[PDB]
């Protein structure tokens, strides 16, 4: 459950948030596979309720109406085509599994759903599954509102409705089996694992009961006896009732402390300095590396009021974002997930974005195709951060140094830091308001290395900055604080 099941040597997954299956299929072939990405976290592939007030928000996909593979991202055959095509070029698919609940209690009964299935939320009826009222926790929840009132009572956090989301009776074998049937259909198709949505809202043991029913991965792509990769979404920033450690027996857990702390550090807020990252990881009170799924931002908190609030860095703060993602991709702690987003018109009111509901780029509700420009950027409002040279090459960096230990740390007691990964990679950052000018021990074999942040190695040449590592491993680094990207990275495969 903890092994990513990505091909050996591939160390990151990318969240292609709201992307269509036909677009992801092609993206695997034209980019993700060749660029060494481990896999793609796709948006919920199961049918959801259509929300019109507001108009087709991204969050309508977290309100299931059935387990049919039919959404704005595409149909079941397109989903299959995507999983097959991606696995064939070595890129896995990880499904965002929304299994804690069905849709909102107030959704109207009818066929206002992504595949036309009928449902009657008012009376908890989902005939397309099928589920009935007795398949929900209404009779188990003791709160007057029927929702979670105290997030300190483990019972209501798990048994009541997460803000009106109809809460499935996960203790019932019928429910457990219906969910497992869905997950197994996906595993058999070729999916490598799952993001378990709203894990905090399910009992660790009910999740275990569902996971235990799952098939081994498809042997057309995985060795026999391979278990699906599981990463559970649990937000725990410390000092709260429910701890992420309660879920370690099921698989990895999202470490939300990661981006919150890194964002605060890179923004140089509240006295934090990059030099304090020397003991990044468990030293900062984070969960064990082998249980962590890390990321700088996720689809929810990149909107500003999620775990970490305004400290979270996103594509909107590109320069700083690249430094945070670069540090994450270079550091050995956790399994890394990179975000890929779409743009929207923000509307801040006293610091809060009220347009955070806006869904993916669309034409009258139909999601727009991801167009690729000659310079590798994307059109139609897709940001495609995963295609930014600075991120793309750091994803490769992580692959190259995979398995190598944290080494050769250096810092200027302020915001200039550097470190390496065994004898295979080295990275230097300047997040101070003045020039970085130092000769540092890289731990790398002597020679000329192409800096992969400013350029690439092509044949026997570099397109950007070159770093000369002397025979004893030391090299001179000069980074202006006015540099577009104030960091340099070199590795065993960027050496000339």
């Amino acid at each position: 459950q903890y092994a990513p099941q990505t091909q050996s040597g591939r160390t990151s997954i990318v969240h292609l948030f709201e992307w269509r299956w036909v677009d992801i299929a092609l993206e695997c072939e034209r980019y993700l596979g060749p660029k060494g990405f481990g896999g793609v976290q796709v948006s919920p592939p199961n049918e959801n309720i259509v929300v019109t007030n507001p108009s087709r928000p991204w969050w309508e996909r977290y309100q299931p109406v059935s387990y049919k593979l039919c959404t704005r991202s595409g149909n079941e055959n397109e989903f299959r085509d995507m999983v097959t095509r991606c696995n064939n070029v070595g890129v896995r698919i990880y499904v965002d599994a929304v299994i804690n609940h069905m849709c909102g209690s107030g959704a109207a009964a009818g066929t206002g759903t992504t595949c036309g299935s009928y449902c009657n939320p008012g009376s908890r009826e989902f005939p397309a599954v099928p589920y009935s009222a007795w398949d929900f926790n209404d009779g188990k929840c003791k709160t007057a509102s029927g929702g979670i009132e105290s997030y300190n009572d483990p019972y209501q956090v798990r048994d009541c409705q997460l803000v009106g989301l109809l809460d499935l009776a996960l203790e019932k074998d019928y429910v457990r089996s219906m969910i497992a049937d869905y997950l197994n259909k996906l595993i058999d198709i070729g999916v490598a694992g799952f993001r378990i949505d709203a894990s905090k809202h399910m009992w660790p043991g009910d999740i275990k009961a569902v996971l235990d029913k799952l098939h081994n991965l498809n042997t057309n792509w995985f060795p026999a006896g391979s278990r699906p990769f599981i990463f559970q979404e649990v937000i725990d920033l410390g000092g709260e009732a429910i701890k992420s450690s309660e879920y370690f027996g099921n698989g990895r857990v999202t470490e939300f402390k990661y981006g919150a702390k890194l964002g605060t550090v890179v923004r140089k807020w509240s006295g934090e300095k990059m030099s304090y990252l020397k003991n990044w990881g468990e030293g900062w009170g984070f969960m064990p590396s082998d249980r962590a799924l890390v990321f700088v931002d996720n689809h929810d908190n990149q909107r500003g009021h999620g775990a970490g609030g305004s400290s979270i860095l996103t594509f909107w703060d590109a320069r700083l974002y690249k430094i945070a993602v670069g540090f994450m991709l270079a550091h050995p702690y956790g399994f890394t997930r990179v975000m890929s987003s779409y743009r929207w018109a923000r509307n801040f009111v006293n610091g809060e974005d009220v347009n955070d509901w806006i869904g993916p780029p669309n034409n009258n509700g139909v999601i727009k195709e991801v167009t690729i420009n000659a310079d590798t950027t994307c059109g139609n409002d897709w940001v495609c951060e995963h295609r930014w040279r600075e991120i793309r090459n750091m994803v490769w960096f992580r692959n190259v140094v995979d398995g190598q230990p944290f080494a050769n740390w250096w810092d200027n007691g302020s915001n200039q830091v550097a470190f390496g990964r065994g004898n295979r990679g080295f990275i230097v950052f300047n997040n101070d308001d003045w020039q970085l000018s130092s000769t540092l021990q890289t731990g790398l074999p002597g020679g000329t290395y192409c800096d992969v942040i400013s350029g690439d190695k092509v044949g026997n040449s570099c397109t950007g900055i070159k770093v000369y590592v002397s025979s004893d491993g030391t090299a001179q680094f000069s980074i202006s604080n006015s540099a577009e990207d104030p960091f340099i990275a070199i590795h065993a495969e960027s050496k000339l």
Partner: nanobody
Amino acid sequence: QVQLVESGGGSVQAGGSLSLSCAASTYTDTVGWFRQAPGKEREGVAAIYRRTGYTYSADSVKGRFTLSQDNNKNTVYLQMNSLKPEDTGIYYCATGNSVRLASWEGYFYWGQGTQVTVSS
């Protein structure tokens, strides 16, 4: 960029009813009603999470007050039944984005309020 228009309220006899309305210029996840009674601090009355229709009501008015949202517009309605003198006060609509409705936190914009006075 957000404006709120509060309607309803006014004078009514004890045991009577009133229906308040809060029309927002844009969508927000949480909308709550608060009131400030004569010489007392502001108090949460009811709140609704707009992604689902889920509502939370203060013990002081549950069963008597019902908050709902329009199916098409960015407007919420507070049906106030069985009113009593203790309900007199200025009622304010507020927009927020908290998922912890019982905490009354996360509000970022407040309306001008509407007077509610319960006689007898």
